[PDB]
Structures are given as C-alpha cells and as structure tokens.
Amino acid sequence: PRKLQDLGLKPASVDPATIKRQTNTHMTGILKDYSHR
C-alpha cells in the first residue's frame, strides 16, 4: 500500500500496522429489579 501511494496510485488497503484492535428479608422474592425506569 505504501508503494502505490508514493507512485500516485491510491492503494485499496492499509498497512496492517495501522489497524488498532479494540436488612429486610420478609420481602425476598417479591421485589422485581426495576434497575432502569
């Protein structure tokens, strides 16, 4: 890819060096988890 870019032609790829791999218990069993709204 670098060789093509230096000669003018746009390369359809990139060097693989650029890729960046990225209390109360009686209520037990009754309360539903309304964590979000």
Partner: protein
Amino acid sequence: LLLDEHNELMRQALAIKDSKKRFAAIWTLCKTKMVCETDVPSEDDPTQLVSRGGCG
C-alpha cells in the same frame, strides 16, 4: 518502542551515553511492559492522558 520519553525512568535511560549500557537499561525497563499503551498519562500531571502512537 514500548516505553516512550513520557516515562521518567525511560528519560534517564535514554540519557546514557555508551550504547552497550544504554541498551541494557532500555531492555530492563521495556521487557516487563506487556501492552502498547495507546494512551499514556501526561507528564505535566497524571490527571489527563496524552495520546501516543500505539495499538493497544
């Protein structure tokens, strides 16, 4: 390089004149780094991180 100039320990290592001992110091510091550290804490303070060329 796994460790850049942003580390104080690396700064002193790079200040060594003779090549043979400079390489040994760098190897000791760098051989224990197991990650590229794409982002490194800024040298001015450790609050914000300054981005450096890396891949994580």
